[PDB]
Design a protein around this ligand. Structure first.
Ligand SMILES: CC(=O)SCCNC(=O)CCNC(=O)[C@@H](O)C(C)(C)COP(=O)(O)OP(=O)(O)OC[C@H]1O[C@@H](n2cnc3c(N)ncnc32)[C@H](O)[C@@H]1OP(=O)(O)O
Ligand SMILES: CC(=O)SCCNC(=O)CCNC(=O)[C@@H](O)C(C)(C)COP(=O)(O)OP(=O)(O)OC[C@H]1O[C@@H](n2cnc3c(N)ncnc32)[C@H](O)[C@@H]1OP(=O)(O)O
Ligand SMILES: CC(=O)SCCNC(=O)CCNC(=O)[C@@H](O)C(C)(C)COP(=O)(O)OP(=O)(O)OC[C@H]1O[C@@H](n2cnc3c(N)ncnc32)[C@H](O)[C@@H]1OP(=O)(O)O
Ligand SMILES: CC(=O)SCCNC(=O)CCNC(=O)[C@@H](O)C(C)(C)COP(=O)(O)OP(=O)(O)OC[C@H]1O[C@@H](n2cnc3c(N)ncnc32)[C@H](O)[C@@H]1OP(=O)(O)O
Lengths: 424, 424, 424, 424
């Protein structure tokens, strides 16, 4: 396509990304090739787009390439690496070489790039009888110092090294340091730049998009690296990060196609907040009734009756939490097999504006869809735009299921009629 | 091309545009069609890219469409419009309709849009025996209030109306109000969104790019509208604005192809700052000598002699200002017709870092080019990167004109050799 | 009176008003006459006095004056107006004419006047079988943007128009948009500038001052306009606004006599926070005792006994909330019919400094007054200034009821004696 | 001595140092021993005292210790080092090792330590036929970014590496990078932490304190390292830095004894601003007269006469600049060989408050001292505290030289008499 079409397409993701914080965990193999200049460039552009950037790199592969050419051999414990005085010192050397190169790359094709003692570490200790030695884990992150640099527009660069109040240095594991930092910052996005195109399903298909549950249930039969990825990405979400992404940092332009297209190129994982939605049974009716009543009084919801609810309780769903009731929604069906209607959508006012509404709408569409309904109607006197913004188009009475067209004519409410199509 | 290629291409213009101020003078016919939704959209995106926006619209065409359907007829004096109480009142109505529509357009496909009493006007008075009445000209612009809103990230919307301390309103001419506002703000860019694709040359070719001089000399045989455009665009430059652009605000996506491509779609006008560059004659030598001397002393410039300068004065150019001498540069030629060399490039240290250097380099390339030289060498001990950043590639001794290869070998300076190709 | 006396009288209301936020809902008939220049002037002065101003106007009457001269006729549903595409467009025109005129008025006899997309609207929908069409209600107010402009000292101007994320405009009802905005801002004062001198009582007397209850109970027999006024003013209070005022915006200088005199010219409505105050019965004594005890221990409250409380429980009042007890206060009476004494005033320390103290004092004066007491004494060892600041003057022992003069002499406490007069 | 005496002595240097900027150029041998923990500690304390710190280290000695153990050998050109791709890469490694260790040292016995791309470099080029290769010199310092970090209280750490807009890295020479940075910042103090105790005189005595002139004239017979030190320290002063210090960064606590004692431990160099002070001859009298006159008129300066000036012109000194006259001061002598008096001290009012006054006082004391005067009197009606703050004690008439005691008695001015002692 044309430039204007590309830019206009990017446009809504530029709006989303702006003034947002992105933690990038970068595999340290990317900090070497022509993959570096490409990456530095793309990172400069993300700066220019008003994305707050915290970049973390790893050092493990560099550490093995040395451990294999020096005679010595690497030891790993749950995926963490035993690091001694020696590998520690080399990891300090690498940090410096890679910071200086990333800066020349960035500067060379000025963007403000900053680096600081933000992390205090502490040794992992001993895992499973094995002393990890100088392997560390972040103990404290100066979250205020970091925000401070990010407020000023600076890009933050972190090596995988932290210090302790004993004057020692420890080698952090990047995959879990990035997820720790993202959580502290409450970064909207954690991005893992790997050498592989996302996370594959059981039959070799790339998982475009996963819940934290589906990510979880993939790891059971996944390689160990991708299980550590998944584990960190899940804890990041759990700790508040809104979205983690896995990309191939080696594939040219990937970061940009990730962030700024509907499509993308790796894997994106998000967590579902909890919402018990179930079939109403008849113990809910007083609960439903008291929710629904003042809305009927207000002219918002169709005059009902309790005996209706009792004989139609099977078409209701309720949303709850700690056994209290925060939402309801009904599915009506018609002589026409292809039609349904969502009716009686209602969220407790104190619990409004958190997405309960939506969650109930979604659940009614899944219900509709499982019985072969492809057209969902909503008739609303006072609430149509809510459905208009959520996929519903305007319709006519002459468009209703025939008996609904009747009720509508005789109810006198003159509500606005709207439909959504639902796909197989 | 691909998305990534488009975005990577935009990238350096996103860097230029960012935190920069753009005044847009918008023809009020654009505020009506599907040209409005397209424009509002593109303007929202420029916001999202961190461009400070001041938008001004005109009302003249709306005013005539009324003046032609109401019976009355428009009168114009130098291109300014006589506006009475009545047309004044309609122009107030239009402002409101067009502000409200631009806001619905913008909001509807939230970006912060602000509008204020920034302008105090005063009547133009009487031109050429003709009373302009309620035609106004900006008398004072609250430049601090404006910056203030722009600092906060707000987009500024202005109607073509200002008030006076007598409690009257006047109808501003948009083309010149925008240029006045841009000048007050010292906006880096003034953009005129018109219904025509830029400014045409004598044979119907679009003028991609003009100096303020070339714009000027076009207007002699130009239509009156485009002469008023040109006149305002010239005064804007003169008053400090760095770049004015003329586009077709009706052609879909034009603003975006303007700002964010090497190419573009309308006309871009810029002003040449003054620089007397001429052939040295022999009254300059003491001037050149005293400039050049301490650089030779420092090992920066080739050991010279005065008798050299006297017998080679014809290959020197000097840069001056108020009769003082701020730069010099030489062109050497060789047995090879295709070769030249820039030597003895030198700017007075007090006058450095304003582009004098560059201006002398440019002038030497134009000189070289007019005698059929296509390869310009520079040999520099201490200054090569200056030429490297300005189009010069690295070369070998074996690449020099043969006699230059000799001198080089026997001078012992071991300088870095660099060439630039020059096109016909 | 003299200038100095007027200014010195204004003075304490200038102190109250300063740095405070006032939302003004302005009837759009005022935006036309010589009532405009007068109003603009007075509003400029309120600016100069450091009052944060948000001004909203209505458009309904303008809309009818058109709907009556164009042939068409207005329809109203609960007092809201059905507005179509056409009246919508005229309402956009009016906004522009009236904003521009208010600005010329203000500027013309410079004060910073700002206007923005602060309001997102949504259609009211269908009321009572009737489609309101383009009638809107505020869905979201950019409360941060507003504060931001108000922080900088800007006066905010709002038309009665909001947009939706569908790119549509809707006509807001001013009386309820102003009350919505005031609530969002938590404005200390909402002011309705009407064409009538406040709100009349059942016999044509102007209600100077009303509780939200008394406003409420007036509306039962009130005209429909004044019932909508009252309804919005009540919800504004309920939602947190401290004071709503109704004035005649057409009566010259009214706003200034409202704000800055003890008197005023329209109607001022305020809401009573809740305080269950009742007669103690004997189930309170352990509650009273435990409150009062540590104060006796501290020398603050007269040594008592439980058998006293039991035989005098009828002279106590208690203040409660959720059945817990937060205050007590006693009324003593004397051989002298004209005398009372407030004794044993005590507020739970955790519940102090919210006006409970005062509420109990007030309730004791109402009690005293209903039995024909015109002189209330308070004898306080440690707390006299509290009574001194609340209407109590210093007195002598020789001033006490005779038997109180006795007890006082023999109790030895040497407390400070103070009286307040109470009127019929 | 006691703690309290030490702290009270430090006290006035803590006041001087506070909110002041200190650039420390650190020899990279200090970044290794137990000299590191000692230094990190002392630097943490300077932070805690509110000193803004920019720290720069060198890498040359590390580079030779490698160049001597790897086979290769170092080349130096004017003291700058030829650095190739290889040594460049090692210098990147060293930076990282030394930054990480300095941070563990500092953290380990949390103070905010920051590091950034503040420096853009460019190759030195070719010196004296010799290509320096990857040897760099700072081209641009982001002085705003630096101040920004320093404003926030952060300590700035710089390696001796900068980048260019070509994406290359270059090895800066620390001694001259520190002096460049200090000048950009206008740091009050540049401190060189070396392995030697300051700068020695011709006979092995440590130069406690030097003018930039005396530093200069030492370098003629100084070792080459100390000549480069001296040269950078002089240009730093010349460029605006107020004080440069040379210490032994290896001698325990030296930095603290430098900054915070009257004494110190290395060498401190400062520059004398220019002041032509000379003997008045008789071409000055109209100049002196016009200066002195309005002060006599004001009662500030003793009534004089021109014929006095003409016959006493030899006891006057004048201060000038571009041949204009900005100060005068006289030395009187007496029958008592041990006494002098400064009289007629006067600075042009436009040129006041820049230290001219002082410079003239100093010059008169040097004059006095060279003729064997050990007691300088000043008699001032209106100006005594100026002399009181500058070493003069209060005295009596009975203390004056006998004939001065006479004049004083008969002049009637009743001025305040003050003396200063002057040492051999
Ligand atoms: C066919 C039918 O069922 S018609 C009956 C529909 N039910 C009602 O009208 C009952 C009263 N209103 C409610 O209960 C509203 O909560 C609901 C049901 C419409 C939405 O429930 P919520 O839990 O608030 O849903 P959710 O959080 O996903 O949506 C919230 C958003 O809906 C928007 N919304 C809510 N009311 C309306 C409305 N009447 N018009 C337009 N938008 C609205 C809210 O402003 C909020 O906006 P935002 O995303 O910019 O914050
Ligand atoms: C072939 C030959 O003629 S070799 C002899 C070249 N002459 C010299 O070296 C003389 C001493 N230096 C000068 O006179 C420098 O001014 C010149 C001639 C190189 C440039 O002149 P200016 O008027 O400063 O030119 P202009 O303003 O267009 O260029 C300024 C930019 O050049 C950069 N520049 C200047 N010196 C150098 C250098 N030695 N190395 C790299 N960049 C440099 C400046 O830092 C400035 O950077 P910026 O754009 O990021 O601010
Ligand atoms: C005659 C008699 O009853 S004497 C016995 C009076 N009772 C006591 O002294 C009991 C201990 N103190 C209390 O219980 C105090 O709460 C009371 C009863 C005096 C006031 O009750 P509150 O609920 O705090 O009353 P309210 O909120 O209306 O008054 C609060 C104000 O009273 C002021 N106030 C409270 N104590 C005193 C005092 N001893 N002296 C002066 N002012 C005081 C508070 O500082 C507060 O000041 P503000 O308006 O500048 O914030
Ligand atoms: C013995 C005799 O010669 S008596 C005659 C002395 N001459 C006068 O009184 C002439 C009028 N005043 C002057 O000419 C003043 O400039 C002088 C001569 C006293 C000082 O000259 P300057 O160039 O200002 O000297 P310098 O800059 O070193 O001293 C400036 C400081 O002196 C202080 N100072 C100046 N006047 C006085 C005074 N009358 N009393 C106390 N302090 C003073 C200034 O406030 C300034 O204060 P700072 O250091 O806190 O800024």
């Amino acid at each position: 396509d044309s430039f204007v079409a590309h830019f206009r397409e990017a446009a809504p993701y530029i709006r989303q990304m702006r003034g947002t914080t992105l933690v990038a965990g970068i595999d340290g193999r990317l900090l070497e090739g022509g993959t570096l200049n490409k990456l530095a460039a793309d990172i400069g552009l993300l700066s220019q787009l008003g994305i707050r950037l915290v970049l973390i790199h790893g050092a493990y592969h560099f550490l093995d390439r040395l451990a294999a050419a020096q005679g010595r051999t690497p030891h790993y414990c749950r995926g963490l690496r035993v690091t001694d005085e020696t590998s520690l010192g080399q990891a300090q050397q690498f940090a410096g070489t890679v910071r200086s190169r990333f800066e020349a790359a960035l500067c060379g094709s000025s963007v403000p790039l900053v680096s600081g003692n933000f992390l205090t570490a502490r040794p992992i200790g001993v895992i499973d009888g094995t002393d990890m030695e100088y392997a560390g884990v972040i103990r404290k992150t100066d979250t205020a110092a970091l925000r401070f640099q990010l407020d000023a527009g600076n890009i933050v660069w972190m090596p995988p090294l932290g210090h302790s109040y004993g004057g020692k240095t420890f080698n952090l594991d990047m995959v879990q340091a990035a997820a720790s930092v993202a959580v502290s910052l409450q970064a909207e996005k954690l991005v893992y730049l790997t050498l592989s195109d996302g996370i594959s399903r059981p039959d070799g298909t790339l998982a475009e998009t996963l819940s934290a549950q589906e990510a979880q249930s993939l790891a059971e039969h996944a390689a160990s690296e991708t299980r550590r990825l998944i584990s960190s990405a899940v804890a990041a979400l759990e700790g508040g990060v809104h979205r983690v992404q896995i990309l191939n940092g080696a594939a040219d332009g990937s970061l940009l196609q990730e962030l700024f297209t509907r499509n993308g190129i790796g894997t994106s994982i998000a967590k579902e907040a909890f919402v018990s939605i179930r079939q109403a049974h008849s113990g809910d009716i007083p609960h439903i009734a008291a929710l629904i009543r003042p809305l009927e009084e207000q002219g918002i919801l169709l005059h009902r009756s309790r005996e209706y609810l009792e004989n139609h309780i099977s078409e209701f769903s309720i949303l709850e939490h700690d056994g209290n009731l925060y939402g309801c929604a009904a599915l009506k069906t018609f002589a026409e097999a292809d039609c349904g209607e969502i009716a009686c959508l209602a969220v407790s006012p104190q619990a409004q504006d958190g997405g309960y509404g939506e969650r109930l709408l979604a659940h009614i569409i899944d219900k509709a869809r499982g019985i072969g309904i492809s057209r969902l109607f909503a008739l609303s006197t006072n609430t149509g735009e809510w459905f208009a913004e959520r996929g519903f188009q305007t319709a006519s009475e002459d468009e209703l299921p025939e008996t609904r067209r009747k009720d509508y004519r005789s109810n006198g409410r003159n509500s606005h009629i709207l439909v959504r199509r639902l796909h197989r």
